[PDB]
Amino acid sequence: SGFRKMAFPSGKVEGCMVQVTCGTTTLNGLWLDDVVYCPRHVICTSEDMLNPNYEDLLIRKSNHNFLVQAGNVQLRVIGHSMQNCVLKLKVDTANPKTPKYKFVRIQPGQTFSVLACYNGSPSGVYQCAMRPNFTIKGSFLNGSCGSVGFNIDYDCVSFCYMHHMELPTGVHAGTDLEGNFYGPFVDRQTAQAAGTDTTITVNVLAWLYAAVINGDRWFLNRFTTTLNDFNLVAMKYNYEPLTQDHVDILGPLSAQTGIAVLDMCASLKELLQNGMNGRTILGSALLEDEFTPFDVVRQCSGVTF
Amino acid sequence: SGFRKMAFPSGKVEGCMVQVTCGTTTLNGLWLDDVVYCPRHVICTSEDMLNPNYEDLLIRKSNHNFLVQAGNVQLRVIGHSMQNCVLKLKVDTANPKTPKYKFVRIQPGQTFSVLACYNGSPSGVYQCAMRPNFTIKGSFLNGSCGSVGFNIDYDCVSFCYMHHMELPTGVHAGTDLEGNFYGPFVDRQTAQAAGTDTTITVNVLAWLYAAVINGDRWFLNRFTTTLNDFNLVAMKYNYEPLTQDHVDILGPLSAQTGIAVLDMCASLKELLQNGMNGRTILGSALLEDEFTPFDVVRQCSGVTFQ
Ligand SMILES: CN1CC[C@@H](C(=O)Nc2cncc3ccccc23)c2cc(Cl)ccc21
Ligand SMILES: CN1CC[C@@H](C(=O)Nc2cncc3ccccc23)c2cc(Cl)ccc21
Ligand SMILES: [Cl-]
Ligand SMILES: [Cl-]
Ligand SMILES: [Cl-]
Known about the structure:
The structure is a homodimer.
Chain A: H1 11-14, E1 17-22, E2 25-32, E3 35-39, H2 54-59, E4 66-70, E5 73-75, E6 77-83, E7 86-91, E8 100-103, E9 111-118, E10 121-129, E11 148-153, E12 156-166, E13 172-175, H3 201-213, H4 227-236, H5 244-249, H6 251-257, H7 261-274, H8 293-301
Parallel strand pairs in A: 8-12
Antiparallel strand pairs in A: 1-2, 1-4, 2-3, 3-7, 4-5, 6-7, 9-10, 9-11, 11-12, 12-13
Helix pairs in contact in A: 3-6, 3-7, 3-8, 4-7
The structure holds the ligand CN1CC[C@@H](C(=O)Nc2cncc3ccccc23)c2cc(Cl)ccc21 (2 copies) and chloride ion (3 copies).
Subunit structure (chain A): 3CL-PRO exists as monomer and homodimer. Only the homodimer shows catalytic activity. Interacts with host FBXO22; this interaction promotes the proteasomal degradation of nsp5.
Subcellular location (chain A): Host cytoplasm; Host Golgi apparatus; Host nucleus
Protein name (chain A): 3C-like proteinase nsp5
């Protein structure tokens, strides 16, 4: 019993975190095989960030301008190249702690664990969701750039996020490990804002199934709904549309609890229109949307890595 | 910016998790140096659990009755002893992944990270607090026994909890790493129940200071309170009493934000009376009590967002 916001075990990623310094700027890098990946803005001074020409700034740097520290060991940079908004520093040593890994780009609503780092040292691990507006509500201070987000499927670490910046509302923006930003953001000190966000409907339904599995049923009702009627209600409360793919993905949880997906949708529709009436679900007075259907099955089944 | 329920990176503990089997029972063990620590109930059958005589059950076991698996490698058990509710299995190999560590017994309200494990393999990491009633609200299934709670301040892992059981309300009970239970619980299947739980007041105040540091002030008010008047109100909402030690502990956060501890107490009294009226504090519609004053200072910036 119990249901917690649970991150993947971070050990496989901790063994990849390094400190990258270029001039006065220090941030985190991800060391996989003989390459260290980090945000390309490590080469910028605060003035450069106003309007940077990254290729021009990079052409002025030599390998010795990048100091990479892995624990208390300096790695030798033997090459440097840029791929989108990520800088790739070739080093003379392959990381002996390199796990089985892949680079994956996730979709909004997908969750991942963030290993927050400062000066190449892991400080904490927390579970995030990629918001529908492509930001993450992370917890990051100055020096956290280069911290990564990941999932684990079996013994393979799928790296999906690298931290780049904080937007004025305190939310965060970053890229996949190929340097492509999530969302319409750019790596420059210019006016940028997170768009209006929406709730991840399939994730709320998954969390309602988790509540039922854990003995909370007060919100269940005798009603069902059509997918079209639910989606009209979802649009009204800034909830993401629920697709037939989402309904299919919720199939296992629906079969385990005996509550059809559209039956759970009728519970959610009532919760939106009426609220919780002083009640809580899994110790929350808000509908939680940062657990995917897979997260719920994994936690409630005890999957290990 | 931002404020998340954040666990310590679990790598240093993952490299210590092993599987311990005794007969038909399999659970997790913590391998540090040449010793594997695990709940002593690994020697019980389900039947033995009502009134087990652990001394009598253990004397009947030899070293070869304990199978310890670290990854795909069987460790050889060369000794066994019981310390309170923990079984200590001496093994012939020191764990090369043993981090700098210590054993610490924590007090209610303290927080820690839990690395939930099954069959010696880590499944997930989450943040917990030792409730005032000495239970923890974990996420644990059958086979999770032996999973540990810890803090990693500096490069030293302080192990503070080992999971032993789930109580009928779905909450969890365990011991420190010396095998002493937290709370009035026993490692028996006898009728046991968690006492009435209460909110960790000092932690709620710490979290209100985190909200102020992150720019949220809507809940502040022009009032202050005496410590005694605060406790008379707070106790009516099943909040733990706030002691002068708690007021002292909140001093740094009080100095950083410019809000005196008793002034923040008056804000808490008003929140208990009014609720949030559709508003949230740090993305929560309830008052959060699983962040200590130490956690807030570690997570938050040294500069308040005035
Ligand atoms: C102007 N500026 C600041 C430094 C860096 C930035 O956002 N860094 C930070 C990241 N995460 C949390 C922070 C919390 C407080 C301060 C900085 C934080 C950055 C990066 C880009 Cl791509 C563009 C601009 C910019
Ligand atoms: C009767 N019984 C059951 C097995 C074990 C126990 O509590 N195991 C479990 C632990 N954590 C979560 C669980 C979730 C579902 C099931 C078991 C769980 C245990 C241990 C002691 Cl010390 C006393 C009694 C007892
Ligand atoms: Cl609601
Ligand atoms: Cl599934
Ligand atoms: Cl303590």
